[PDB]
Design a protein around this ligand. Structure first.
Ligand SMILES: CCCC/C(C)=C/C=C(\C)C(=O)c1c(O)cc(CCC/C=C/NC(=O)OC)oc1=O
Ligand SMILES: [Mg+2]
Ligand SMILES: [Zn+2]
Lengths: 226, 170, 164, 112, 12, 95, 1119, 57
């Protein structure tokens, strides 16, 4: 949404619900507070600057000229809180407050659009979708397969639980909650059948092949094909 | 991993790459057959070039052609685009792209089956009609429920049998 | 060059037709009637010949061409199937064989099975049709069983409705 | 007789290429016009891919169902309707190999 | 690149 | 709508169970013969060209009408899989 | 009857010749009517001149000069009608004079060579390519001129652009990126803007000071001095810059190309490109483009002015140099002529190509005729344009108006060079310039919106495609008739006013009165009004101008109105609207519906088939009347007389009426009295309730016709005989097959009757071993031929009205190869109005008949006259077209006043005048009621009670005075009809015009049980005697997926469509009252698996335990 | 439920062939059984354009 011109700040309508389901870079991004502390601002000519600080540490964040700041010199700002005005990038909010924050940010900011036009759809539905936007997690402390890999969350709760409950052998599998847009979430799933369905099918197959992938039939598209 | 290199090219079934009689004397065949010939001819010319004697510029020249052809049937267009002959500067369809076209991004490109007991007409408000029902043209009900009717035809004196009942309604 | 193979004669033959054609158009301003191509070509050329050659020369049509508006229309969807028995046919040969088999069992196997197997099993000659018994008992039972079979089938009209 | 539960794509071993196949397609001739019938040993050949005519064979030596499954002598033919023709695979054997473009040219060359 | 030129280059 | 649909919905643990039961019940109502029903007596299925639904109109309308009564029993594993078809053949005749 | 038209607007000039666009575009395209001594040399002759002087000099021996003398085409091979009976393409033969010169003594002139058969146009404006009348649609694009435009990535400064069409011809751009470079691109890569000027002769000192003294950017020009110090060497230097590895020496070769002939263009010297020059930038251009080859030293009056203006455009206000591309002075319209002349040129080039080869082939000097010319290129080229061009399409003759529109609609899409579908939203919208030039309403609902559109009322293509339009000349506060057809560009220079401005004759009447400078509404004074609009009409298209009170209807649903008329079906009873705009009359006349009289005279004979009038000049001519003719779409085109025997004829008076005219007036549909209220539910969202009485009279009824054909083919199994012989069962079917073979004329053919019979052979010599037995048994009636006979497809036929039997080919008809003979069978049928049909007024109210009520019980007025159709109010608020509610009112008056009126587009009727006519109506409706003997009902008073409590009648007055009030409001009292009681509250009623719409082939309510299937993909397939299945798409899958419809979905994918063994056992099972088997694998899958196996991938199904399972039953295993 | 007015919109019609297919079809897929929307627990069988107009007056 919007067009490069002077200062067009948000994105409305469907274009936005797109920008939301697929975790994307809003044009008017709002710098969030990675830190939860107190605010401090400055006057020099070119760029502004908001500083969050606790008895522990402080962090500066460049807030260029257009930046309309919502926070004032004085009070507290929880992690992932709007420090700039406008849109927020789900990934950032994820790494700041956590899965629990992006999730509910995605949901409500999506209904912000519908509600505004008239549509009254229950939250449930957007939840089911967003949920599977984060079904994936990244690995940093391996056991069975190399570290940098993106794999299904519960599929790790499988190998992890078994490794730790039984004597571990030695591997507590350390992961990182990963956020991916609805379109990519599904682009990369278990069953190659379904992946062959969505656009990339020349590749989907190639790799499902090499790995001798067995498609367990669960899920309707993959099972309807057959 | 040794299998990624092809030396034995599987050939798709024949009835799946028909040869049919159209109208007047015109024959229609699956584009695939023009690619297959390519391969076959080149593969043969190759063998004959090996046995005849072998100037190696000439053997590679063809080993290349051969490779290109091996591509063509599999997937056309990832490199150079094959055209039978003037009339259609249209890429000969190919296995790869037949499969894709199936489920790939387009509006449903070529996605959707056609059902055997169906039918459609213009709709019109049925005020007295109850939620429960809907008014369906009898004439439609007839070939819709034709087989279901045929036997109740037989279950009652209207017709002696099944083929009877069919011609009775032709 | 072509999909359907054609020997080097039909080839040099057809090339001459087209050659001869070009030359003919040079004069009339009328795409020659096949009458004029026969002539120009020579000794044994007639309409039936040019027409045929112009047909064999007609290369095939690509089973997969953009059809109607070019959008997304392949040509193959439009071609019907001709070996495969549409449900109507499966039903036909069901009753036909079901009751053709009922008649076959109720008849004397002597000349019924003879004509049933020498016409229905593999392809099949009167004298050579019956085992040891000559033609007088063949014709005898063939024509007498075949009519008794037909006249009772006349009573209980099952076959009357000409099956196909 | 067993509920299909898992589907699996896996690379094709040249020996499995031939495992699936029936006879080689060694000549470019589709269908010769005089007799609209599969010609030498080419794309269509009732013996490689299957019997074109429903249960009958090619020369007519054997023609009906009872002997279902036996092959002719001068013209190779095992029969079921034209459908077996429709499902059977034939193979071609290349002089000097070549490779799949699917594996060579995919952003991440799976061989590169 | 374009299969005609490198062969031509080749034998020419 | 259709007779005691609610009453029906209430009998099952799952909606999709009431669909499986009726559908399979209608199946057998035809297969073993149609009188397999438990309710021919005083009031049962009826149609008006003549009242003859008593014989074979809709299988499924029956199944529901019977299930709405408390005679049938639908379990997850009530009677051994293959052995039933055998004893049902034995007892219910015009097949 | 009579006619009254409200509040005038002084109509200054009549509407131009409507089909003018397509008619005379072909006139100036081909000049056959007038020999080569006439000056108009564009199009064909131009194209000819363009590629005729074929100069071929040296490579071996040359000095070839083939020259063009005169082009002349004249005797049509066959005529129009025979061209339709027989499949023929109506084309005129063309042979021009040609003479080739020699470098040796001799010039052989072989006069003619008939190359190219070029189609001709019908007097109406439509063609005849193959059997069907076709139409060439016009198009739009960027016209050739130099322009300047902004820069999107870097907000800094804008760049210049030189646009030269044809395609072959450079495309220049001037951009300055000062850290050290300037960019001037022809094909792509940039070079110093100065290296070129230096080549032509502009030196750093004279250039920089005169051009950019006022432009500091001049410093970028004199920057690379090292090269600017050598003139002619710069020519070679640039040569070096383009890159092949070319010979430095080539005196004046490539400079020529960007010089005089090819690349820049042969578009007429003077107005084609030099227009975009002198006004936009750089004032002079003689010689077509930057051209010269006289001294080897080139002159470029174009190269410097472009930079001139970039320097200027960047600097300040020389003028404000910003080009809105969507200015019609920039986006031009391609009329038919140009479209052909281009394809004619392409052919000529293809011709001139082959001929070049034969200048070396021919032995010695006799090489003029055959040695240089071959007609197969021009033929294939032109022929492909009229028959395969995406631009030429089936004429849409649902009804005349239609064809007229399709005759003049400008599409975007086309050559591909102009506007493909990718881009659009800037083109799709209506631009300020589209005024009087393109309707803002006519575009098509749907994906393809705003890109395809018909032009406006007076809007006409000046000689080169710039939709311009008429405007009067107001001098001071004085308005005049001298109308200037002003180009799109010049229009911006003046202050134009609207016609609505109060006028006494030549005077302007109000101080502050509207006008609009350039695309922007401006309240100007009488002293600034330089020009005035011709008519409100020129603002829209013909097709739209036909709407009564367009003024009160939302431009959105007026479009619907315009497009709806394009779907009007000719009714045997045609009526003009109770209220018309004023163009009905000229639509049928510019269109060629009705037959008008040349000069004055008297009528001799008035047949149902011919009116032989006899003029006063002492001459008499027979005017045939296309009795019943098939229209490309299937609508009746009958010319039916309107003049009696021995009659005076006005010059130009209707002798016969067209398919849809009543009396010279356009008529589609019929005026019918309508009550505007709610019925049960019969008119619920957009349903129409209709009175049976409408059917009693032959009111909404229309005649249809469709041609069924069948060929006798020549099979190698034996020719397909066409005989009365139908091998297998009854003579009862043969009755109407009267003439042995074909069906008898006037025969009633219902679905499934033999229209024609033919016979082919089946199986080879021995068909069925089992069935041969049956045949010997029951009765050997052996005639091996098969019944392949054209029968009446489901859906329906009517009565046979015409048949054509073309045997192998002795007329002048060419039969296709294999084709033994063809047999067509035209059939016609009456389509009565019925519940499935759909009717819609001009405003936009569209809807379908939901119930045909008995005149017995629908709403009836106090005096026994009941309403024919009952329209639901609710459909009026949401949509916004009160105009229909205004028509209904004016109508009510017209009914009791027995008159019809004409309310112009925006000046027409005005609420007081209509309340006035209603006043006059009240006396005819209630006046007679007084005299006839009775007063007011208990009911009539009762409704008045619920009327005053409402607020429609001034309490206290008398019922006779109250009802007048009530009536003036347009609503009268109505009783139920089914109860006699009144309908609480007055309801409006009146004469609303409503048309009936054409039924597409879709209308045919499909219904399919079982039927054919596709050969490769075995899915249900529509056929000759079975309907063909409906698609179950993704969206519909999910629908079921959402529900717990497990089996129903499986069914849709197996038993019903792909499960080969499934559908069979399915059928049979159903037949015995058994349930359908449970699904086998779908060929869908199997085709995939194999398609997948085709590629090295091995797809294998597996078991419980990873173990192969089998989809392909047993056909893949080579045991 | 189906966005459908009567300006010409045409509806398609299919037939449940197995006893099961119909079982589900009329038990859980018949119209009168699905009155409340899956989007909101708010009725979809809500008196439309005319019915209200009437019941209101
Ligand atoms: C390697 C390729 C995998 C993709 C794939 C399924 C190919 C299936 C092919 C070619 C078919 O034979 C085919 C079907 O079986 C079914 C339908 C219509 C039903 C569509 C159902 C869709 N559900 C869905 O999208 O559920 C979420 O379209 C079809 O074309
Ligand atoms: Mg609609
Ligand atoms: Zn044989």
């Amino acid at each position: 949404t919007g067009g490069v011109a002077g200062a067009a700040d948000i994105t409305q309508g469907l274009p936005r619900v797109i920008e939301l389901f697929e975790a994307r870079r809003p044009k008017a991004k709002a710098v969030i507070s990675e830190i939860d502390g107190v605010v401090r601002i400055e006057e020099t000519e070119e760029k502004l600057s908001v500083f969050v600080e606790s008895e522990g540490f402080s962090k500066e964040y460049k807030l260029p000229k257009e930046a309309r700041l919502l926070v004032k010199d004085g009070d507290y700002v929880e992690a992932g809180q709007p420090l700039t005005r406008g849109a927020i990038d789900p990934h950032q909010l994820l790494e700041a407050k956590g899965p629990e924050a992006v999730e509910r940010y995605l949901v409500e900011e999506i209904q912000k659009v519908y509600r505004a036009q008239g549509v009254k759809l229950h939250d449930k539905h957007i939840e089911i979708v967003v949920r599977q936007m984060m079904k994936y997690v990244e690995v940093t402390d391996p056991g069975d397969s190399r570290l940098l890999e993106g794999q299904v969350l519960e599929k790790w709760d499988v190998e992890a639980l078994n490794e730790r409950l039984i004597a571990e052998g030695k591997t507590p599998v350390a992961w990182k909650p990963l956020l991916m847009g609805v379109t990519k979430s599904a682009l990369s799933t278990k069953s190659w059948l379904s992946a062959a369905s969505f656009q990339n099918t020349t590749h989907v197959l190639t790799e499902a092949a090499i790995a001798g992938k067995k498609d367990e039939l669960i899920g309707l598209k993959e099972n309807v094909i057959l | 991993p040794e299998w990624m290199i092809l030396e034995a090219v599987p050939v798709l079934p024949p009835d799946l790459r028909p040869m049919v009689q159209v109208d007047g004397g015109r024959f229609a065949t699956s584009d695939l057959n023009d690619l297959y010939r390519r391969l076959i001819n080149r593969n043969n010319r190759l063998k004959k070039l090996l046995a005849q004697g072998a100037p190696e510029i000439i053997i590679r020249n063809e080993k290349r052609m051969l490779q290109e052809a091996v591509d063509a049937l599999l997937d056309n267009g990832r490199r150079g685009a094959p055209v039978t002959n003037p009339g259609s500067d249209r890429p000969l369809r190919s296995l790869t792209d037949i499969l894709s076209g199936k489920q790939g991004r387009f509006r449903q490109n070529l996605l959707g089956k056609r059902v055997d007991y169906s039918g459609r007409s213009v709709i019109v408000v049925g005020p007295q009609l109850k939620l429960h029902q809907c008014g369906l043209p009898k004439r439609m009900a007839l070939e819709l429920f034709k087989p279901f009717l045929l036997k109740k035809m037989e279950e009652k004196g209207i017709a002696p049998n099944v083929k009877a009942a069919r011609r009775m309604l032709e | 060059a072509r999909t359907i193979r054609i020997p080097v004669h039909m080839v040099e033959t057809i090339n001459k037709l087209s050659r001869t054609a070009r030359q003919l158009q040079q004069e009339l301003g009328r795409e020659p009637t096949y009458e004029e191509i026969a002539e120009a070509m020579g000794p044994g050329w007639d309409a039936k010949r040019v027409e045929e050659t112009l047909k064999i020369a007609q290369e095939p049509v690509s089973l997969e061409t953009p059809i109607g508006d070019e959008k997304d229309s392949f040509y193959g969807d439009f071609i019907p199937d001709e070996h495969l028995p549409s449900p109507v046919d499966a039903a036909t040969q069901s009753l036909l064989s079901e009751e053709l088999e009922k008649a076959l069992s109720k008849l004397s196997e002597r000349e019924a099975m003879v004509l049933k197997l020498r016409k229905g099993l593999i392809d099949g000659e009167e004298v050579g049709a019956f085992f040891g018994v000559t033609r007088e008992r063949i014709r005898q039972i063939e024509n007498k069983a075949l009519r008794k079979l037909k006249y009772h089938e006349s009573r209980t009209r099952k076959l009357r409705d000409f099956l196909d | 007789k067993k509920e299909v539960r898992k589907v699996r794509i896996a690379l094709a071993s040249p020996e499995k290429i031939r495992s699936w196949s029936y006879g080689e397609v060694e000549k470019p001739e589709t269908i010769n016009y005089r007799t609209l019938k599969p010609e030498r040993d080419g794309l269509f050949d009732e013996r490689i891919f299957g019997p074109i005519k429903d249960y009958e064979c090619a020369c007519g030596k054997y023609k009906r169902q009872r002997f279902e499954g036996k092959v002719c002598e001068r013209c190779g033919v095992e029969v079921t309707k034209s459908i077996v023709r429709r499902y059977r695979m034939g193979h071609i054997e290349l002089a000097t190999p070549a490779a799949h473009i699917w594996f060579v040219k995919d952003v991440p060359s799976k061989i590169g | 690149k374009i299969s005609t030129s490198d062969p031509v280059r080749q034998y020419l | 709508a259709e007779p005691g649909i609610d009453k029906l919905f209430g009998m099952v643990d799952s909606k999709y169970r009431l669909t499986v039961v009726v559908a399979k019940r209608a199946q057998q109502l035809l297969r073993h013969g149609f009188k397999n029903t438990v309710l021919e007596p005083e009031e049962r299925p009826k149609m008006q060209t003549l009242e003859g639904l008593f014989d074979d109109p809709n299988a499924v309308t029956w199944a529901m009408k019977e299930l709405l009564t408390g005679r049938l029993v639908f379990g997850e594993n009530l009677v051994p899989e293959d052995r039933l078809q055998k004893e049902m053949e034995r007892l219910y005749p015009v097949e | 009857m009579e006619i009254k038209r409200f509040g005038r607007i002084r109509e200054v000039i009549p509407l131009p010749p409507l089909t003018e666009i397509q008619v005379e575009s072909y006139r100036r395209a081909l000049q056959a009517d007038v020999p080569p001594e006439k000056r108009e040399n564009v199009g064909i002759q131009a194209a000819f001149r363009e590629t005729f002087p074929i100069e071929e000099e040296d490579k071996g021996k040359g000095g070839l000069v083939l020259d063009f003398l005169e082009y002349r085409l004249g005797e049509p091979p066959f005529p129009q009608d025979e061209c339709r009976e027989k499949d023929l393409t109506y084309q005129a033969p063309l042979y021009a004079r040609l003479q080739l010169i020699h470098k040796d003594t001799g010039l052989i002139k072989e006069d003619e060579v008939f190359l190219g058969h070029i189609p001709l146009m019908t007097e109406d404006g439509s063609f005849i390519i193959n059997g069907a009348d076709r139409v060439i649609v016009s198009q739009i694009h960027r016209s050739p001129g130099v322009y300047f435009t902004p820069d999107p990535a870097r907000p800094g400064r804008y760049i210049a652009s030189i646009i030269p069409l044809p395609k072959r011809g450079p495309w220049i751009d001037l951009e300055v990126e000062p850290n050290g470079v300037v960019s001037m691109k022809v094909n792509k890569r940039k070079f110093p803007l100065v290296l070129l000027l230096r080549v032509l002769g502009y030196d750093q000192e004279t250039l920089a000071r005169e051009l950019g003294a006022y432009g500091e950017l001049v410093q970028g020009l004199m920057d690379e001095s090292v090269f600017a110090m050598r003139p002619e060497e710069a020519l070679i230097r640039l040569f070096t810059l383009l890159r092949p590895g070319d010979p430095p020496k080539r005196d004046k070769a490539v400079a020529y190309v960007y010089g005089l002939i090819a690349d820049p263009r042969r578009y007429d010297l003077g107005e084609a490109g030099r227009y975009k020059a002198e006004e936009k930038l750089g004032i002079r251009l003689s010689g077509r483009t930057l051209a010269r080859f006289e001294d080897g030293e080139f002159k470029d009056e174009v190269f410097l002015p472009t930079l001139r203006y970039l320097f200027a455009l960047t600097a300040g206000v020389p003028g404000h140099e910003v080009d809105d591309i969507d200015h019609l002075g920039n986006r031009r319209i391609r009329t038919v002529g140009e479209l052909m002349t281009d394809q004619f040129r392409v052919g000529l080039a293809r011709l001139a190509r082959g001929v070049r080869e034969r200048m070396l082939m021919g032995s010695e000097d006799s090489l003029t005729p055959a040695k240089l010319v071959n007609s197969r290129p021009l033929e294939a080229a032109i022929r492909e344009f009229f028959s395969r061009s995406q631009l030429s399409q089936f004429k849409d003759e649902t009804n005349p108006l239609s064809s007229l529109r399709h005759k003049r609609r400008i599409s975007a899409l086309g050559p591909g060079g102009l506007t493909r579908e990718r881009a659009g939203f800037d083109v799709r919208d209506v631009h300020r310039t589209h005024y009087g030039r393109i309707c803002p309403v006519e575009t098509p609902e749907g994906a393809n919106i705003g890109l395809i559109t018909s032009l406006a009322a007076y809007a006409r293509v000046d000689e080169l495609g710039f939709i311009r339009t008429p405007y009067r000349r107001v001098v001071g506060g004085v308005v005049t008739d001298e109308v200037v057809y002003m180009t799109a560009t010049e229009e911006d220079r003046y202050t134009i006013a609207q016609a609505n401005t109060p006028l006494e004759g030549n005077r302007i009447a109000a101080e502050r009165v509207v006008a609009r400078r350039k695309g922007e509404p401006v309240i100007v004074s009488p002293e600034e009004v330089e020009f005035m609009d011709v008519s409100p009409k020129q603002v829209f298209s013909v097709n739209t101008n036909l709407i009564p009170f367009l003024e009160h209807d939302d431009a959105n649903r007026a479009l619907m109105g315009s497009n709806m008329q394009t779907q009007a079906v000719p009714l045997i009873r045609a009526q003009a609207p109770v209220v018309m705009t004023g163009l009905e009359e000229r639509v049928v006349r510019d269109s060629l519906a009705a037959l008008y009289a040349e000069e004055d005279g008297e009528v001799a004979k008035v047949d149902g088939n011919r009116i032989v009038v006899r003029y006063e000049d002492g001459r008499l001519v027979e005017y045939p009347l296309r009795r019943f003719y098939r229209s490309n779409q299937g609508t009746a085109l009958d010319q039916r007389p309107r003049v009696v025997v021995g009659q005076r004829v006005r010059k130009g008076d209707l002798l016969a009426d067209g398919p849809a005219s009543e009396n010279g007036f356009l008529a589609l549909g019929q005026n019918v009295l309508v009550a505007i209220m709610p019925f049960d539910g019969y008119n619920f969202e957009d349903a129409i309730v209709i009175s049976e009485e409408l059917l009693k009279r032959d009111f909404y009824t229309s005649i249809h016709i469709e041609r069924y054909e069948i060929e006798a083919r020549d099979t190698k199994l034996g020719p397909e005989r066409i005989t009365r012989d139908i091998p297998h069962l009854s003579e009862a079917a043969l009755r109407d097959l009267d003439e042995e073979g074909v069906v008898r004329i006037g025969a009633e053919v219902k679905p499934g009757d033999i229209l024609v019979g033919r016979t082919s052979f089946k199986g080879e010599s021995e068909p069925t071993p089992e069935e041969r037995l049956l045949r010997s048994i029951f009765g050997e009636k052996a005639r091996d031929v098969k019944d392949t006979s054209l029968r009446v497809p489901p859906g329906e036929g009517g009565i046979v009205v015409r048949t054509v039997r073309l045997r192998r080919g002795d007329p002048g008809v060419e039969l296709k190869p294999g084709v033994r003979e063809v047999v067509r069978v035209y059939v016609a049928q009456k389509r009565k109005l019925q519940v499935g049909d759909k009717l819609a007024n001009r405003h936009g109210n569209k809807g379908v008949v939901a119930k045909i009520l008995p005149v017995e019980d629908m709403p009836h007025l106090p005096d026994g006259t009941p309403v024919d159709v009952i329209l639901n109010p609710l459909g009026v608020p949401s949509r916004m077209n009160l105009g229909q509610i205004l028509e209904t009112h004016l109508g009510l008056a017209g009914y009791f006043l027995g008159q019809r009126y004409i309310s112009p587009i925006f000046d027409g009727a005005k609420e007081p005048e209509i309340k006035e006519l209603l006043a006059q109506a009240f006396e005819v409706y209630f006046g007679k009621r007084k005299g006839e003997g009775f007063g007011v009902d208990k009911r009539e008073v009762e409704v008045l009670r619920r009327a005053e409590k409402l607020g429609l009648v001034t309490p206290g007055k008398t019922p006779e005075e109250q009802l007048k009030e009530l009536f003036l409001q347009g609503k009268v009292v109505l009783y139920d009809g089914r109860t006699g009681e009144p309908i609480e509250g007055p309801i409006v009623v009146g004469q609303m015009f409503i048309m009936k719409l054409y039924h597409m082939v879709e209308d045919k309510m499909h219904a399919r049980s079982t039927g054919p299937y596709s050969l490769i993909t075995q899915q249900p397939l529509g056929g000759k005697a079975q309907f063909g299945g409906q698609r179950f798409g993704e969206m519909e899958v999910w629908a079921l997926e959402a529900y717990g419809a497990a089996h129903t979905l499986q069914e849709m994918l197996t038993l019903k469509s792909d499960d080969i063994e499934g559908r069979n056992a399915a059928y049979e099972a159903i037949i015995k009252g058994e349930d359908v088997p449970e699904p086998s694998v779908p060929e869908s899958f199997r085709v995939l698996v194999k398609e997948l196996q085709a590629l090295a991938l091995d797809v294998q199904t597996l078991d419980e335990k990873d173990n192969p399972v089998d989809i392909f039953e047993g056909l893949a295993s080579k045991r | 439920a189906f966005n459908a007015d009567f300006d010409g919109d045409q509806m398609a019609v299919h037939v449940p062939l197995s006893s099961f297919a119909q079982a589900e079809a009329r038990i859980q897929m018949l119209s009168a059984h699905n009155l409340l929307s899956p989007a909101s627990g708010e009725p979809l069988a809500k008196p439309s354009r005319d019915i209200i107009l009437g019941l209101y007056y």
